[PDB]
Amino acid sequence: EQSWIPKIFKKKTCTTFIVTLCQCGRPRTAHPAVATVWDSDAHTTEKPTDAYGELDFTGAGRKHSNFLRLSDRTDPAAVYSLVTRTWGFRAPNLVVSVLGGSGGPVLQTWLQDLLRRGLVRAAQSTGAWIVTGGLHTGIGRHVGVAVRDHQMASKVVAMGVAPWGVVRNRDTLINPKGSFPARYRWRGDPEDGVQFPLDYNYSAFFLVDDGTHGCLGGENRFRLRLESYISQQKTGVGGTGIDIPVLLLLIDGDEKMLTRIENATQAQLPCLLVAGSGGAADCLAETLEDQGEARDRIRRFFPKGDLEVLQAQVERIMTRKELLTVYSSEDGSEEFETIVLKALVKACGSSEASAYLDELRLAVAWNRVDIAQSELFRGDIQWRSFHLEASLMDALLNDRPEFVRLLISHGLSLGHFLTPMRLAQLYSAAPSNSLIRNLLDQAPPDVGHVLRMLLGKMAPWSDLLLWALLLNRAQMAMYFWEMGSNAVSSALGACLLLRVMARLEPDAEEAARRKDLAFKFEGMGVDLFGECYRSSEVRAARLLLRRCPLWGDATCLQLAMQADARAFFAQDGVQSLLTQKWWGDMASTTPIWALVLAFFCPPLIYTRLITFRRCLRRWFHFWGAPVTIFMGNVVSYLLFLLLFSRVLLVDFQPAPPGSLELLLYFWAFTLLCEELRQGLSGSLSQRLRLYLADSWNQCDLVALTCFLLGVGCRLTPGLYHLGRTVLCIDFMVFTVRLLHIFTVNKQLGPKIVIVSKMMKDVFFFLFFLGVWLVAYGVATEGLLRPRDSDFPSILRRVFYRPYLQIFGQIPQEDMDVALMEHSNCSSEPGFWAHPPGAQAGTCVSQYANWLVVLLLVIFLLVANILLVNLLIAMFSYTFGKVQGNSDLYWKAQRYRLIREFHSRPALAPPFIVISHLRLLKEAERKLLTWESVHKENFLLARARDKRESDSERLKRTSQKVDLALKQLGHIREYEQRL
Ligand SMILES: [Ca+2]
Ligand SMILES: [Ca+2]
């Protein structure tokens, strides 16, 4: 498809002769026979192009480097079309052209670092093009190597523009019929100051033909024209795209470089200068910062310094200083994205809202939100709605919280923005093999199924909040919550979901971040609800908490319980509401002793002792209050245990059951019926699973099952003893279950949790102790060689006896031989002793008995001190862990207890049979608006506090005084002029 390249582009030949040696440098011997001052084009003959094609550098390389030779006087439009379409290079999001001779093949280390870090990182983030001299020397070589390094670290493309005539091995690049393959010898031994080797890091090269055999500056005009054309081009899609930004980076130079800068500025293309680069660059920087003649002579070599044409050039540059921008090193800042944006914004001026999109996209690609707000969203420009859609999508995909907040702030309609496709893309933005990615793959967004799987399945803002939580983007999730619908319910649901995912996550550090985010959400919800309660107790308490939202169709309290958000239960409003429920219709301030006394004197309730026809109302109010039900159940449970113990210890006989035993059976059946009612009324499978999820219910089921098995066994003629044994164990289970009632008390509440946690430590210590006991017991048993050797006896002497030794029961008479009477026990050789213990073996060997005593000493030490105190240290650590939060645990237990007893029959178990037989909108809008108003007040107060923080004051005063210093310089210059 290259049959037309010669047709459009052309090559230039010296043709005419202008004087041994001529201007063009071609030897007089080799010159056209057709032949004052050399003419760039008049003394030149145009010919079809002949050096087009692709390069494949020998050795390491990409085997593809589009190289084209074209005439200097070529329209940039055709070149741009060729590059964009034929060669497949996508339209750049940015173009940077580097300038400056950079004298010396090796450049300053600071300059090299600044270039390779700042410029190349900016290009990588934005995916830009870089245009430099396609020469493997100095700044061009440095740019090429840095670009290649960042490509390997990965898109950035490097473009070469070098004169045709300073490139070595030109003849290797001449083919009229096509040069798709090509070998370029870029490491030739000979070296000359005229010809230079092409770099091998550039994806494409441009060789301007000026009809000369070697010179410099033959590409300045073409390069400037191409840059200007780029500056006036859209990023594809014809005019539907947006302007492609461009700027020129200057690093040192000479008078010719200064002229190049002046031409570029007259072309209205931004230029950036680096301080300390050297001549032609530092001089302009100093001029911008600000004797002028002295500096011109100082910062530039003596030649041309006297020439006032340099002064005129400097004045011309100053005339259009709006485009030039200096690079503040700032002690190796190596950060200038903000500088690029500042130059781009100050170089536009006119505000049409259609040419500022590219700067916005660049700002999104970077994290210069402050710059964009200061200029792009300063209000001068009229930002539309559709304008910001793409920028918002990009910011969301790249996790730009501040930027997305800014974009939404300035008149962006989320409702008209979010689309099923958009949400699908947002979810597809999951990071590589992330947990959310795994869940989505295992499970259109298809998000309902994953949520139902996690939680249990038993307005764009909500969707965005869910997405942020799933992808674990803290700032964006916080922002989305800040402008949601159901603030408190959303906060609790987010805490629940985050904790579930964290406990499910394998990262072990991502889980830490999720837990931290959950804590932040819980804190925000707690603060918001505290303010809501302070404003109006009745509204908040009654309606906000005890309401089923859309999040999971479960009251806020249920969400808090599932999330274990104890801090939520720990606040004033929740506890006041819980106490009010716990005391039912009675006054919450009634003394406990008053209630207890009234419990045993039912007539007494009709006096002033208890504070709340009237008689029946009062009676039902007293006996229906959940606290009274709790006291009655406690009394009945204690009586049940007493009856159980009585039967078990006295009235249990092989004979058929007696009256008391039948009463116990009826009582146990009643308890079973009550537990069945709890399970069946607290979606049948879902309710059953919820009921079984509570540890106390599991204990109740175990106890009742053991009781049933015991009754069945005893009733059988030949299983009386087994029945009695299992009943004893069942009684133990019931007595342990009795602990549930201690949760009502603050002091005894957390102790249950402490014991439950210490059980795990006991388990692990059991592992350790089992190992040590096996070791020591087997060793001792082998040493003693007792003659009983019966397997149960061996297990006794191996495990049981040392275990008691841990607790001070040391049977010396059964181990020491000095304490036993010697006897001729067995025919086996050696001496034997006869221990007095019943289960110590008939007679033990006394061969090496001192070793047995030594083992006893070591075991006593290790077990009785080291291991026991290791376990005790674990206990102390556990206790301390759940001691600083004792109140929180107690509050959570308070809620669980109140919920349990709020929905229980008013009668105690033994009589509860009759109760069981008896068993057999705009308001929400207003409430949510009130909640949202208080949320806004809370956020505003928090932001006000943040603004008054010391760091914020320091930042604000620093920026303000920077503005003051700028204004002071401005007024000083004004006074100087006048
Ligand atoms: Ca622009
Ligand atoms: Ca229960």
Curated annotation (Swiss-Prot):
Glycans are attached at N824. GO terms for molecular function: ATP binding; calcium channel activity; calcium ion binding; calcium-activated cation channel activity; calmodulin binding; identical protein binding; sodium channel activity. A motif (Selectivity filter) lies at residues 807-809. Displays weak voltage dependence, and repressed by decavanadate. Calmodulin-binding confers the Ca(2+) sensitivity. ATP is able to restore Ca(2+) sensitivity after desensitization. ATP inhibits channel activity. Phosphatidylinositol 4,5-bisphosphate (PIP2)-binding strongly enhances activity, by increasing the channel's Ca(2+) sensitivity and shifting its voltage dependence of activation towards negative potentials. Activity is also enhanced by 3,5-bis(trifluoromethyl)pyrazole derivative (BTP2). Changing Y637H: In PFHB1B; atrioventricular block. Disulfide bonds join C825-C843. ATP 2 binds at R148, R384, G411. Residues 942-947 are annotated as: Mediates modulation by decavanadate and PIP2-binding. Changing K757A: Becomes insensitive to decavanadate's voltage modulation effect. GO terms for biological process: adaptive immune response; calcium ion transmembrane transport; calcium-mediated signaling; cellular response to ATP; dendritic cell chemotaxis; inorganic cation transmembrane transport; membrane depolarization during AV node cell action potential; membrane depolarization during bundle of His cell action potential. Changing R499A: Becomes insensitive to decavanadate's voltage modulation effect. Residues 796-816 dip into the membrane without crossing it. ATP 1 binds at R187, L198. Keywords: Adaptive immunity, ATP-binding, Calcium, Calmodulin-binding, Cell membrane, Coiled coil, Disease variant, Disulfide bond, Endoplasmic reticulum, Glycoprotein, Golgi apparatus, Immunity, Ion channel, Ion transport, Membrane, Metal-binding, Nucleotide-binding, Palmoplantar keratoderma, Phosphoprotein, Transmembrane, Transmembrane helix, Transport, Ubl conjugation. Ca(2+) 1 binds at D243, A355, D358, E359. Changing R566A: Becomes insensitive to decavanadate's voltage modulation effect. Changing K746R: In PFHB1B; atrioventricular block. Residues 940-978 form a coiled coil. TRPM4, is a temperature-sensitive ion channel, it adopts distinct conformations at different temperatures, markedly influencing where and how ligands interact with it. Decavanadate (a positive modulator), ATP (an inhibitor) and Ca(2+) bind to different locations of TRPM4 at physiological temperatures or at lower temperatures. PANTHER family: TRANSIENT RECEPTOR POTENTIAL CATION CHANNEL SUBFAMILY M MEMBER 4, TRANSIENT RECEPTOR POTENTIAL CATION CHANNEL, SUBFAMILY M, MEMBER 6. Calcium-activated selective cation channel that mediates membrane depolarization. While it is activated by increase in intracellular Ca(2+), it is impermeable to it. Mediates transport of monovalent cations (Na(+) > K(+) > Cs(+) > Li(+)), leading to depolarize the membrane. It thereby plays a central role in cadiomyocytes, neurons from entorhinal cortex, dorsal root and vomeronasal neurons, endocrine pancreas cells, kidney epithelial cells, cochlea hair cells etc. Belongs to the transient receptor (TC 1.A.4) family. LTrpC subfamily. TRPM4 sub-subfamily. This is Transient receptor potential cation channel subfamily M member 4. It comes from Homo sapiens.
